[PDB]
Amino acid sequence: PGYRPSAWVHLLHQLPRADFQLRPVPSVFAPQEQEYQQALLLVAALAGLGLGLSLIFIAVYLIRFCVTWSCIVALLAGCTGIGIGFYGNSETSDGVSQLSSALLHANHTLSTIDHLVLETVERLGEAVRTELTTLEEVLEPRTELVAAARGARRQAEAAAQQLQGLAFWQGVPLSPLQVAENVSFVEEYRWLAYVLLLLLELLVCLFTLLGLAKQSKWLVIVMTVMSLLVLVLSWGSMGLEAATAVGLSDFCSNPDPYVLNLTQEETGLSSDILSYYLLCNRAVSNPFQQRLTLSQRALANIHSQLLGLEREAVPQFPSAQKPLLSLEETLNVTEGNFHQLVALLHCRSLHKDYGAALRGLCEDALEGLLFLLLFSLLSAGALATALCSLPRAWALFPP
Amino acid sequence: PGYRPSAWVHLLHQLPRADFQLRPVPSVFAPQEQEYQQALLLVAALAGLGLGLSLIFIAVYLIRFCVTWSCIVALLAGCTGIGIGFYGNSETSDGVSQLSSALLHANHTLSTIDHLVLETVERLGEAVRTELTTLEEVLEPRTELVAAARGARRQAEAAAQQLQGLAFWQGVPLSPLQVAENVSFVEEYRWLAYVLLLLLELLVCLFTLLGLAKQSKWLVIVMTVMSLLVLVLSWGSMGLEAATAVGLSDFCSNPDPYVLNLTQEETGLSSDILSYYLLCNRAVSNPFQQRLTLSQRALANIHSQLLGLEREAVPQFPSAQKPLLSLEETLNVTEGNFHQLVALLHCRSLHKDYGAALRGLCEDALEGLLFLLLFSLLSAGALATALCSLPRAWALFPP
Numbered sequence: 001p002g003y004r005p006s007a008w009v010h011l012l013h014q015l016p017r018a019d020f021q022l023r024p025v026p027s028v029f030a031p032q033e034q035e036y037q038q039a040l041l042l043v044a045a046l047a048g049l050g051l052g053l054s055l056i057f058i059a060v061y062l063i064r065f066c067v068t069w070s071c072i073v074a075l076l077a078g079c080t081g082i083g084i085g086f087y088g089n090s091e092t093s094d095g096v097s098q099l100s101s102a103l104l105h106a107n108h109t110l111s112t113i114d115h116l117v118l119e120t121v122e123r124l125g126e127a128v129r130t131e132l133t134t135l136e137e138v139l140e141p142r143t144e145l146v147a148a149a150r151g152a153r154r155q156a157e158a159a160a161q162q163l164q165g166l167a168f169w170q171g172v173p174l175s176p177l178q179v180a181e182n183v184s185f186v187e188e189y190r191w192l193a194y195v196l197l198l199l200l201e202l203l204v205c206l207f208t209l210l211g212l213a214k215q216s217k218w219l220v221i222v223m224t225v226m227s228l229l230v231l232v233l234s235w236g237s238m239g240l241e242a243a244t245a246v247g248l249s250d251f252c253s254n255p256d257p258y259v260l261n262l263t264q265e266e267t268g269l270s271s272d273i274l275s276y277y278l279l280c281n282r283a284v285s286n287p288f289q290q291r292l293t294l295s296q297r298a299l300a301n302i303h304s305q306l307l308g309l310e311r312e313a314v315p316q317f318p319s320a321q322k323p324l325l326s327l328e329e330t331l332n333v334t335e336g337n338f339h340q341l342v343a344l345l346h347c348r349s350l351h352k353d354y355g356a357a358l359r360g361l362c363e364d365a366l367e368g369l370l371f372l373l374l375f376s377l378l379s380a381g382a383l384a385t386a387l388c389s390l391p392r393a394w395a396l397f398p399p
Numbered sequence: 400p401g402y403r404p405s406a407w408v409h410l411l412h413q414l415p416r417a418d419f420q421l422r423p424v425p426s427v428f429a430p431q432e433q434e435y436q437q438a439l440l441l442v443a444a445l446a447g448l449g450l451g452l453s454l455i456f457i458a459v460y461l462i463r464f465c466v467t468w469s470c471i472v473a474l475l476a477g478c479t480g481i482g483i484g485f486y487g488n489s490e491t492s493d494g495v496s497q498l499s500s501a502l503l504h505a506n507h508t509l510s511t512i513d514h515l516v517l518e519t520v521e522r523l524g525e526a527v528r529t530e531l532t533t534l535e536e537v538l539e540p541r542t543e544l545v546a547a548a549r550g551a552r553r554q555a556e557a558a559a560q561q562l563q564g565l566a567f568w569q570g571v572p573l574s575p576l577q578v579a580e581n582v583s584f585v586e587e588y589r590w591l592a593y594v595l596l597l598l599l600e601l602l603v604c605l606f607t608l609l610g611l612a613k614q615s616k617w618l619v620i621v622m623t624v625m626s627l628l629v630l631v632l633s634w635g636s637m638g639l640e641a642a643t644a645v646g647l648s649d650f651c652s653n654p655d656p657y658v659l660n661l662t663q664e665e666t667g668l669s670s671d672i673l674s675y676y677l678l679c680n681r682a683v684s685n686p687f688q689q690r691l692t693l694s695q696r697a698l699a700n701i702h703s704q705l706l707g708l709e710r711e712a713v714p715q716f717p718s719a720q721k722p723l724l725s726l727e728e729t730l731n732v733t734e735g736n737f738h739q740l741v742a743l744l745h746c747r748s749l750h751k752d753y754g755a756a757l758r759g760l761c762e763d764a765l766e767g768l769l770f771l772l773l774f775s776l777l778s779a780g781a782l783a784t785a786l787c788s789l790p791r792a793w794a795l796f797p798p
């Protein structure tokens with residue numbers, strides 16, 4: 001099936017970006033780059049200019065002055081906005097949780113791969129030791145039996161070498177667990193902060209409602225400054241989350257060799273492996289293919305040689321029965337482990353995890369960021385109406 | 400990792416259920432046991448009883464009668480409730496969409512296995528034809544070359560016979576695509592119905608606000624019966640969704656044996672296969688292992704004597720040199736296809752799809768159903784307050 005970028009991804013991608021140092025920008029995801037970071041900060045600067053324009057407009061309205069139902073409508077609009085904000089916060093938290101689970105499963109898969117390789121090599125080594133025991137048991141050097149034993153030992157050594165070569169995550173500094181725990185850590189703090197902001201806005205709205213119901217002049221003016229502060233906070237939150245959404249949408253564009261380049265810089269793995277596990281198409285062939293065949297061939301060869309020692313050596317050399325059964329059991333166990341490894345070296349083992357990671361990072365996270373945008377716009381409008389209405393009614397109380 | 404039942408599913412599982420015929424129900428998911436169906440209908444009956452009690456209480460309130468700010472507070476409470484309803488509808492739609500996507504992916508996987516097995520056996524048949532070509536071009540029957548050719552042909556036939564049985568979804572009547580299509584179909588119909596109900600309640604709330612703001616008595620009495628009807632329909636929706644949530648929670652608690660039995664009754668494949676792909680733990684073992692353990696031998700075995708024809712027949716039989724490359728290419732393609740098949744027969748992919756299906760069906764669907772429960776409760780409370788307040792101030796409207 002694959003991953004299809006959403007409509008919002010292309011809608012935000014086509015947006016023109018500029019810088020005061022140099023307006024032309026490639027509009028291509030590139031962290032640790034001056035132009036991209038400066039443009040993303042300029043987006044928040046534009047949001048701050050919107051803050052300033054709203055403040056000037058409300059000040060002008062108040063100076064020019066210098067209906068309650070409008071205030072109730074504004075606070076109901078704010079309640080709808082904070083519901084949208086709760087939805088968006090839950091959505092983005094779910095998306096980043098999906099991302100963290102994706103890297104957790106990726107680490108589990110890589111661990112399982114290199115692990116199974118490790119004990120497969122260990123079992124092959126124990127098979128080599130028991131084969132040495134069999135040769136020690138072979139006192140009379142028969143023309144064919146010792147040759148079969150030597151061939152089986154060489155085949156076991158070759159299979160051990162190929163299995164040692166199969167492991168690819170061994171010896172890389174990067175591990176997904178360390179880059180998933182930190183992202184979960186940051187996401188937890190971000191969710192906590194936005195939940196606190198949402199609760200503060202709910203308290204502000206409830207204070208407005210209580211002051212209107214109680215007809216308490218004091219309450220109104222006391223929390224008007226808090227309303228102004230939460231308006232400024234919502235404006236700045238819009239700027240920050242809009243920059244985050246723009247960056248995320250630019251990252252989620254259809255071409256993604258950026259992830260491949262970043263991983264090749266960080267882990268240092270060859271591009272053929274990374275291309276295979278990040279594309280999983282018929283154009284890219286398995287980098288582990290040939291080796292995976294060779295080892296299995298050796299294994300098959302071993303079994304054949306084993307049957308020889310099973311069909312001729314056992315009646316002549318009865319003491320070799322138990323070690324031969326030991327080799328047979330090791331062969332069965334290592335063939336099961338080899339099948340598990342081959343199942344774990346396919347694209348779907350990790351390409352599906354990467355697809356789910358991108359799903360959580362775009363189809364969930366970007367939608368959550370847009371819902372935070374809608375939160376910020378609705379909250380700014382509702383609080384502007386509040387600072388336009390409540391002062392017009394503060395002194396206008398019957399007592 | 401595995402599937403971990405949540406707290407809500409365990410909380411709803413322990414609830415006691417009763418039936419008018421036979422009170423002690425086993426409280427075990429069984430869509431074929433009648434007592435289960437009457438037990439689930441009893442929840443909707445209890446919700447209807449709550450409807451009746453609320454109607455009696457509001458009628459008593461109006462009869463005993465026979466502040467607007469309370470009405471505004473109730474309307475903002477209803478706005479919060481319908482926001483919760485939006486969230487719950489989106490959550491349950493997302494969960495059922497995840498289930499449908501998992502079922503579609505299960506189809507795509509199984510189709511990949513059986514189509515790939517068909518392609519592999521056809522390629523082995525073409526290899527048999529080319530081996531017959533080698534046999535006919537072998538005019539002089541050398542004591543070793545003809546024996547090697549016969550052994551290669553027999554090994555190819557044995558490998559084809561062993562591989563012909565791998566496809567376990569070739570003969571089953573059930574198709575996951577039809578199940579996914581029908582569950583989707585039902586899902587968008589239910590989503591459309593609930594979206595229409597939510598918009599109807601939003602219109603009711605907006606009409607309430609307009610009636611209070613414009614002091615239009617005529618409108619309020621006209622839409623009072625509308626509010627009563629939406630109250631009744633919300634109570635009925637609460638009953639239906641509560642029954643659905645109870646059933647889903649009772650299912651999600653230890654669903655593996657029930658799903659295994661249902662799939663045994665429908666597909667009728669085998670005990671070992673379904674248990675393997677629904678458990679994927681260490682205790683369950685590969686049922687295809689020996690099968691695969693044979694095939695990967697034969698193909699590899701073939702390669703051995705292929706080198707014989709490469710090492711002795713090539714200088715003697717340049718005509719045989721021509722199709723030997725074709726045979727080797729077929730061997731390479733079938734080895735790649737066999738590795739793909741082995742990667743496709745591990746429980747990891749299908750059990751991962753099943754785990755995602757259960758995740759969407761429980762950890763998302765249960766949350767959606769409980770958010771619908773909250774929607775229903777808050778909507779019932781807000782509408783009860785609305786029918787307790789609006790008749791008071793209908794005639795008390797200033798004009």
Ligand SMILES: *[C@@H]1O[C@H](CO)[C@@H](O[C@@H]2O[C@H](CO)[C@@H](O)[C@H](O)[C@H]2NC(C)=O)[C@H](O)[C@H]1NC(C)=O
Binds near residue numbers: 104
């Ligand atoms: C997540 O990553 C850590 C760090 O890599 C895993 O710890 C092991 O680290 C060793 C290094 O010698 C590697 O063999 C493997 O990467 C890891 N596996 C084991 C147990 O040997 C840690 O176990 C990983 N956690 C998960 C989810 O598997």
Ligand SMILES: *[C@@H]1O[C@H](CO)[C@@H](O[C@@H]2O[C@H](CO)[C@@H](O)[C@H](O)[C@H]2NC(C)=O)[C@H](O)[C@H]1NC(C)=O
Binds near residue numbers: 507
């Ligand atoms: C989904 O299942 C259907 C039905 O099994 C697949 O459609 C075809 O089904 C017939 C027999 O049922 C077989 O020829 C193949 O299993 C399918 N052939 C083709 C060309 O599709 C369908 O392929 C499955 N997968 C998808 C993605 O639809």
Ligand SMILES: *[C@@H]1O[C@H](CO)[C@@H](O)[C@H](O)[C@H]1NC(C)=O
Binds near residue numbers: 261262265
């Ligand atoms: C990959 O990244 C490095 C530095 O991170 C950069 O120099 C290089 O140009 C990138 N690759 C491509 C193809 O742009």
Ligand SMILES: *[C@@H]1O[C@H](CO)[C@@H](O)[C@H](O)[C@H]1NC(C)=O
Binds near residue numbers: 688
């Ligand atoms: C090899 O292991 C498999 C495990 O799937 C088992 O079924 C089979 O009997 C074993 N072979 C022997 C000879 O014990």
Ligand SMILES: *[C@@H]1O[C@H](CO)[C@@H](O)[C@H](O)[C@H]1NC(C)=O
Binds near residue numbers: 431664
């Ligand atoms: C499986 O289902 C059938 C009918 O659907 C039922 O008769 C049988 O008892 C079930 N299995 C178990 C173990 O209960």
Ligand SMILES: *[C@@H]1O[C@H](CO)[C@@H](O)[C@H](O)[C@H]1NC(C)=O
Binds near residue numbers: 285731
């Ligand atoms: C067999 O297929 C592999 C996979 O691409 C390839 O690398 C190898 O060269 C092929 N063998 C021959 C003899 O061409």
